[PDB]
Amino acid sequence: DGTEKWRFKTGKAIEASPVIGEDGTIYVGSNDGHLYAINPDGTEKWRFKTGKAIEASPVIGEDGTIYVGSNDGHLYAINP
C-alpha cells in the first residue's frame, strides 16, 4: 500500500529513531527539546520538555519507565 496513516508535527527536525512501548505508544525525541508519546491513532498522549534537543532514541525499562538523554546534559526518567 504505502499510504500515510497519519503524521505528527514537532517543532524541529527529528534525528533519532522512535521507540515503541509494549502498549503501542510511539515515543520520539525532537530537536525542539520534547520527548513525545504518541498514541497508535496519531493523537498526542503526552509531551515532556527538556531544555535542549534530544539527539538519541529513548530506552524503556522493565516497569515501563522511559529513559532519555538530552542535550541539556540531563538523563531523564519519565513515568509512562
Binding site for a copy of itself (CB under 8 A): 1-22, 24-40, 42, 45-48, 52, 55-59, 61-63, 65, 67-80
* Angle CA 37–63–31, to nearest 5: 30
- The conformation of residue 72, written as its DSSP 8-state character, comes to T
Distance CA 10, CA 62 (A): 28
- CA gap 46, 39 in Å, rounded: 9
Grid coordinates given for 16: 533519532
